[PDB]
Amino acid sequence: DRKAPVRPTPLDRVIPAPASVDPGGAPYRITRGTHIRVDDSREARRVGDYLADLLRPATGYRLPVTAHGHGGIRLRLAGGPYGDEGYRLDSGPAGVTITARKAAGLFHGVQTLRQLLPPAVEKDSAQPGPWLVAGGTIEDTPRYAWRSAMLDVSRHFFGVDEVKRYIDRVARYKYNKLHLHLSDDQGWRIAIDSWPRLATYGGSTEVGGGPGGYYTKAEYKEIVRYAASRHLEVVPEIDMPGHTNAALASYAELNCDGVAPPLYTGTKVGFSSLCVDKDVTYDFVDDVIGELAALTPGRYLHIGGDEAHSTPKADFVAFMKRVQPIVAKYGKTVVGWHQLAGAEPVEGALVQYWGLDRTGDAEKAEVAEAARNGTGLILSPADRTYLDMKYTKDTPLGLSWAGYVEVQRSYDWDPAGYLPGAPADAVRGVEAPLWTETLSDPDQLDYMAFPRLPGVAELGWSPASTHDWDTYKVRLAAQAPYWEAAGIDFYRSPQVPWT
Numbered sequence: 001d002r003k004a005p006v007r008p009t010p011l012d013r014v015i016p017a018p019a020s021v022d023p024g025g026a027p028y029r030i031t032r033g034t035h036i037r038v039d040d041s042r043e044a045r046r047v048g049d050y051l052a053d054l055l056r057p058a059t060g061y062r063l064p065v066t067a068h069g070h071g072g073i074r075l076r077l078a079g080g081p082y083g084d085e086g087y088r089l090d091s092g093p094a095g096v097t098i099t100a101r102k103a104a105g106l107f108h109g110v111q112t113l114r115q116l117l118p119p120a121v122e123k124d125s126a127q128p129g130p131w132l133v134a135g136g137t138i139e140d141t142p143r144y145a146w147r148s149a150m151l152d153v154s155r156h157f158f159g160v161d162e163v164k165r166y167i168d169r170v171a172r173y174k175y176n177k178l179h180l181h182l183s184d185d186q187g188w189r190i191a192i193d194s195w196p197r198l199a200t201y202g203g204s205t206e207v208g209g210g211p212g213g214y215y216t217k218a219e220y221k222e223i224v225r226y227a228a229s230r231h232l233e234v235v236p237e238i239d240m241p242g243h244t245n246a247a248l249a250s251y252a253e254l255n256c257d258g259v260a261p262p263l264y265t266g267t268k269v270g271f272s273s274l275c276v277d278k279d280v281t282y283d284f285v286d287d288v289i290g291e292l293a294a295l296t297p298g299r300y301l302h303i304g305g306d307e308a309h310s311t312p313k314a315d316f317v318a319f320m321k322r323v324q325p326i327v328a329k330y331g332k333t334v335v336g337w338h339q340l341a342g343a344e345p346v347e348g349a350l351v352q353y354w355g356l357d358r359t360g361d362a363e364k365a366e367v368a369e370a371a372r373n374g375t376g377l378i379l380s381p382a383d384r385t386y387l388d389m390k391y392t393k394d395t396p397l398g399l400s401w402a403g404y405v406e407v408q409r410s411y412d413w414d415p416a417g418y419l420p421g422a423p424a425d426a427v428r429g430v431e432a433p434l435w436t437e438t439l440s441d442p443d444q445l446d447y448m449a450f451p452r453l454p455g456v457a458e459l460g461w462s463p464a465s466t467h468d469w470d471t472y473k474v475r476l477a478a479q480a481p482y483w484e485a486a487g488i489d490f491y492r493s494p495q496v497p498w499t
């Protein structure tokens with residue numbers, strides 16, 4: 001009876017671990033007549049409809065969403081100590097009420113509610129239930145404001161629907177940002193009107209060759225819209241000056257020698273570089289960032305900056321000196337991989353650290369120094385949160401350059417004191433990147449994303465005081481029947497006592 005537990009799931013048994021859990025009294029039971037009461041606002045109803053859509057299939061209930069009456073499930077916006085993303089969830093025979101200051105908070109409360117319900121809730125056909133919600137109160141707020149998941153659509157392209165699917169996977173764990181690696185050596189995935197070939201030619205293939213793909217502006221806007229409905233702020237990335245072969249292959253004039261390189265379909269890195277010496281390089285960058293900014297309602301613009309190994313340190317610094325301001329010109333906050341820390345980050349910038357344990361002190365120091373100078377830090381250690389890294393030497397997909405990363409290793413650490421000498425207040429959050437050199441379909445993304453994805457979300461959301469592998473693995477283990485019911489393939493780590 002894994003799919004239909006005899007009794008309700010513990011109120012504290014959710015991922016991320018809630019900031020505060022106070023169980024008590026009897027649970028609430030959703031019955032055929034349960035109404036979803038929301039405030040009389042478009043945003044409030046939006047969350048209500050979202051919730052209704054998640055429950056209707058498995059319950060087979062009407063679950064109407066209205067702005068009147070005393071529905072058994074109440075979503076209400078009101079003042080309180082919950083910030084822009086927190087909420088309170090009260091459960092008892094009198095019903096379930098989720099209170100928050102903003103829609104995002106209600107949305108997060110919903111993500112908790114779906115875990116409080118039984119595994120059968122994931123099914124697409126009417127299930128017996130019962131639809132119980134442990135009784136008590138949960139007061140929940142996030143530790144970090146930057147909790148993202150990155151999807152590489154450059155190595156292997158994933159269409160709009162596949163991205164929507166991944167978005168739903170991450171929305172389950174309260175991630176609030178979706179970083180999209182839109183360009184690299186093997187592909188350019190976003191149409192740029194001023195430079196048409198980037199997409200038509202630069203997006204013509206991918207790793208392994210064959211058809212590639214790219215997002216027309218309409219498709220990209222739909223991805224942003226959908227992400228926004230799941231309260232994910234999209235952070236687009238146009239990697240530069242390295243990892244730029246798709247662009248270079250599309251316009252010969254972008255290459256220092258004026259010759260266009262062949263489209264790249266391999267899985268190596270570091271050989272490409274924009275021409276720091278040419279003026280057209282900066283017109284190109286300005287045009288791209290300008291058009292990308294117009295498609296980005298979010299606050300950030302990621303310019304990459306990683307592995308520009310064919311770019312002399314001096315040219316890299318000069319390049320970043322010149323391009324960073326372009327981001328602000330179009331009203332956005334720049335984000336770059338931590339190599340940017342060695343090229344003078346502008347005010348307000350954030351750098352994403354992707355080093356690992358074996359990374360040298362000098363490199364870590366440069367990043368910690370940037371933090372000291374006001375640069376925000378996003379932590380995504382390659383031997384910690386990279387979803388493309390193999391679990392063990394036997395994992396069929398993924399890479400292993402950063403070693404092997406089992407479930408415990410991915411979860412068992414504290415962002416606050418991870419980087420030596422880095423001020424804890426400089427840590428904006430964490431990110432779980434999923435590179436796709438070896439992944440070409442949605443099922444493979446799931447296998448490499450789960451079960452580590454929930455863990456990184458917890459690191460970004462939960463209080464340090466709730467962090468504990470031995471108790472966390474029990475909560476993680478409880479997800480098995482839900483994932484199985486949802487058709488979400490995942491790695492059955494031997495380190496987890498799967499339910």
Ligand SMILES: CC1=N[C@@H]2[C@@H](O)[C@H](O)[C@@H](CO)O[C@@H]2S1
Nearest residue numbers: 269306307337354388399435
């Ligand atoms: C930043 C980074 N740049 C590289 C990416 O281009 C690869 O896809 C990834 C594979 O794990 O490794 C590092 S992370």
Ligand SMILES: [Cl-]
Nearest residue numbers: 168169172486
């Ligand atoms: Cl999902």
Ligand SMILES: [Cl-]
Nearest residue numbers: 265266267268
């Ligand atoms: Cl190669």
Ligand SMILES: [Cl-]
Nearest residue numbers: 267268269270
């Ligand atoms: Cl390589």
